[model samples]
Target chain A: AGAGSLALSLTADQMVSALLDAEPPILYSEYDPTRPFSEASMMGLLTNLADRELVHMINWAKRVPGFVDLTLHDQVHLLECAWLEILMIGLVWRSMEHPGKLLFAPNLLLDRNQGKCVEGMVEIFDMLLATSSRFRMMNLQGEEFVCLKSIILLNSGVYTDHIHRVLDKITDTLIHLMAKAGLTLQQQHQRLAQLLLILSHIRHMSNKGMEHLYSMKCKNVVPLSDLLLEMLDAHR
Target chain B: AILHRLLQ
Candidate 1:
């Protein structure tokens, strides 16, 4: 099966990293220290997150036949339709209580200067559903309807509590859906393990300590070697 | 038409 082949070819981590790497950059851009972090502003701050992701998808799709000719809007639609596949995989890894899996995809994207993976995934889906009605892709029924209904339910509740519940439900539903779609439990587990490893690799690459080293050099806090020696001494 | 116009 196509799913099985994909699972075998791409470890869970690689797929997750790809998804994360394809996320919007603005989500992780430096926040304004002066401005209070408002939930409303945060939500808006993430608006361009999907746009950047769509750009990545468009760029990637250029390599595939039939996909290269797709209009930008249609490219977004395809990404939207296929996004559940990535999200479902992410949810399964998350439900396994692998904290390391959290933001694994997004972090990798940040390392690659791609963008925020989670926000991109969510935004692409939103854009797809929004435009679906216009495209008349199908009757005004089915998955899109359920997605819209669920989002409304999420938004109707207290923001923090609702977002938490919504995320949990989404993860649980993804696992259930993947299982029902005939992906073996072992395959899912393998996917999760592999995704975690890839995320670790990205995390290693984009460490804040490296950035701090550069910062110290800029500020003349200490010579880089001295700072390194101090850290090594502390470890010893 | 109105919706399209508004979108535009």
Candidate 2:
């Protein structure tokens, strides 16, 4: 019980601006490809990238319109539920630029075979590749990606009136974004439905990813951040 | 900028 009122009055432009402002900078990895890959090294590389991404993920959530209106606990709770899904969405978007690869960051690119260096990673990489392939086929636009991400984060949490309206606002913005793209009514409807459908795959990947991360911790492969540990430990 | 182009 917090955040007295979620009276959001942001226009499409304001919402878009807020979203873009909150977009994380391009992260780089210190991954040294020349070094012979060890299981620990590979796992460390993957988890470390996620640790950094999770930091920016928290910041993005904080700045996403109407997230500030959530009770602090609810905000954190929603993050716990959706952080991996959010990460996957952004990851999938970046990888779409280069088909058949996982782009963890600007420098951290992994082909399907390269990703198998870590135990249990091939399966995860395949899931990500599948998502990347789907996104590429759709030719997902940036605005659609951001709007769908907002929906993912907001929808992950238990409903509150404020949450409901914020979802509505983002949905409205998405519709406007689509209309300006000259999408016919039929195209817009199908695109919206298809975009939402992609989330189910993302949700499934989130569970698989969490399990992979937990296994990494079990093997002591990487020294995870306290924040990462907390998020990994959440809602189990 | 890209999104802006798309908006256009």
Candidate 3:
């Protein structure tokens, strides 16, 4: 119950609760991926599906503690740099939600064989599938997932002490939750360390994902939205 | 208890 040097009014509890509250629902509930499997059909559905989520993602970002307080330029640049990383984390979570399949939405699920519709698609799915498996092994929870996702978003690309403080606050929130979950101090630290390592793999996946999208865009395989194109081209 | 609180 102590105050700090920063003018930050958002407590760790408030920050985490806001994150959970601002969490976007799957928008494309009517998405039907049962169409014929071709490069265009598959990629087109995926690009559109991702584009749908991207909107909610940006909205979700603004809800993050101390996020909207940043300068306009910094906010734009941060989103540009971290959109893929944020999206990857969401996708991995969805994959874990429904094991052995990638849940692009409530209705759109892609298995490994189905992932082969587009070149390089299957490989990326395999990596994500493996990551989801790891998350499964760890028994990652919803509150922890939201907290970890927030950490990745706040910690993305550039580093500012302000953002660092925000991250610290989030880490505190997560640890407190873990402790309440019955983890000892040692166990809490160990869990956080392992969760931080998951971010490394996420960065790798985001990198490879952007590359694949750039290639797909060049080939005119799928019709990517301006939003998706901007994020892809920013990193390319 | 926390792990099983909200399964999603």
| TM-score to true structure, per model | 0.26, 0.90, 0.89
Clashing pairs in 1: A12-A195, A13-A194, A13-A195, A20-A105, A21-A109, A23-A115, A24-A115, A24-A116, A25-A115
What is the lDDT of every predicted structure here? 0.32, 0.80, 0.78
lDDT of candidate 2 over A89-185, digit per residue (tens): 9889999988889888777788888876788889988999999999999888888888889989999766417787788888788788888899998
Worst 10 residues of 3 chain A by lDDT: A1-10
How much is A116 displaced in model 1, in angstroms?
19
Q: Model 1 segments beyond 4 Å from truth?
A: A1-36, A69-76, A83-236, B1-8
Ranking of predictions according to lDDT: 2, 3, 1
Per-residue error for A15 in candidate 3, Å, reads 2.3
**CA shift at A188, candidate 2, in angstroms?**
0.7
Candidate number with greatest lDDT: 2
Regions of candidate 2 where Cα sits further than 4 Å from its true position = A1-7, B1-8
**Could you tell me which 10 consecutive residues in candidate 1 chain A have the lowest summed lDDT?**
A107-116
